[PDB]
Design a protein around this ligand. Structure first.
Ligand SMILES: *C(=O)/C=C/NCC(=O)CCO
Ligand SMILES: *C(=O)/C=C/NCC(=O)CCO
Lengths: 260, 260
């Protein structure tokens, strides 16, 4: 079962462009497909923002408890948690969990503002060795996902390497690494994406993304039953602005790269 | 009408037996398909067990914080949370969250044992006016899903009415209703099931289930964009003992009954 042929056969029937990077931590092996091409991150960028706030919390003792005001003018296009707290507050822990687990776009804008704007998220990426990631705009326009636009993009290779360092390596302090893994494992939005291509016994923490041009993304840490963890990035984007999501493509890509 | 044609077409093309009950709380209207037939509940029974322990906590006010020993011998077939706490303890709140949001089977068995066995779960159903629900076994045998077997079954109509009373009505005290809704909204397993058939802006709390005979279930409380909440039960089972899961059939059924 040649994995490269199978990923090409999936892509050719998909109506889009597929990017895959798998890191198997049992042996540091990698499976790469368009892994050095740039894809729009969409909501998968929320992992870098939440991680940068966790890094801040290593030096600002009570940071995750700090209340942040939510005003009516802050609401954007998808605010399932933040709309409950308008003319009130959410803590930076609650905004981190809302952004990662509920993909709340207002919550992500508060994380970006806590970092000094999109460039502060990029700066944290650079501080942990990621030279590829770039965040350029706030929610919701960071999800436009226009083909060819470098704004708000990374590569599968870079994002897999970064996600390994954040969740399994030492980019964060041990308490903060554990909190990041707890949050990803509590994701509510992932079951139809990478997880749908894996056996029922395997444990996943992930962050999805979706945006214009049918962009459909997932980045995951995987704890397979009786195996060392995997990191898997699956990015997908389509040529028409109003294309439909294709989470099924991501599930198929995950099955192909884990079957062996 | 068209909804009945679409559900019968989904069912026929799937090869299985589909049960649907939708309650629209805007006007108490319903959409029903095989809504009085019995289906194996599988892990959707965890909602009744967690609700029964919430009910106990209305009078045993410290019960959710009670430590429960997790022994190696207590682990069954899918225990993603309990395996991290073997030779230690989890509280009944932690076990309720694990059962509901991670579908942990070891956690469900501790809820059942807290209630004095499967009959305690049934007794709570009867106390809140559900005369249909029955729990007969523990995990994992409650998931055998043998055709014709009435054990560990309910009807879509009965489960939709119960889930309405638990999440939107007064089967529970207000704090316990809110706690059940917070748990369901934090489900990690549901994005391929009812949630996949609904517009992205709608808010869902749900509990999935899976078992023998390709049994694939979901029960959900839904807060549609700008509308009164819905309750939706989708139950699905297949003729072959080893049939694969079909979460796409539940997503298809949800789209059909909410499109109009
Ligand atoms: C992540 O890519 C974006 C997450 N939230 C926005 C939506 O879910 C838009 C649905 O219309
Ligand atoms: C609910 O129906 C069952 C939950 N636990 C079993 C699994 O979902 C995974 C089996 O490996």
């Amino acid at each position: 079962a040649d994995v490269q042929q199978k990923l090409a056969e999936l892509e050719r029937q998909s109506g889009g462009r597929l990017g895959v990077a798998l890191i198997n931590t049992a042996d540091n092996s990698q499976i790469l497909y368009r892994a050095d091409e740039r894809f729009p991150m969409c909501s998968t960028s929320k992992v870098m923002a939440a991680a940068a706030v966790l890094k801040q919390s290593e030096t600002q003792k009570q940071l995750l408890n700090q209340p942040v005001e939510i005003k009516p003018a802050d609401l954007v296009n998808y605010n399932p948690i933040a709309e409950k707290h308008v003319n009130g507050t959410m803590t930076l822990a609650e905004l981190s969990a809302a952004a990662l687990q509920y993909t709340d776009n207002t919550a992500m804008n508060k994380l970006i503002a806590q970092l000094g704007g999109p460039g502060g998220v990029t700066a944290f990426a650079r501080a942990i060795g990621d030279e590829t990631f770039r965040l350029d705009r706030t929610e919701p326009t960071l999800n436009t996902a226009i083909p060819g636009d470098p704004r708000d993009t990374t590569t599968p290779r870079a994002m897999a390497q970064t996600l390994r360092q954040l969740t399994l390596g030492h980019a964060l302090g041990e308490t903060q690494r554990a909190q990041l893994v707890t949050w990803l494992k509590g994701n509510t939005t992932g079951a139809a994406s990478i997880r749908a291509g894996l056996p029922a016994s395997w444990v996943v923490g992930d962050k999805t993304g979706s945006g214009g041009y049918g962009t459909t993304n997932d980045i995951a840490v995987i704890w397979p039953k009786d195996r060392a963890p995997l990191i898997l990035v699956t990015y997908f984007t389509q040529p028409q602005p109003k294309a439909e999501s294709r989470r099924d493509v991501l599930a198929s890509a995950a099955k192909i790269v884990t079957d062996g």
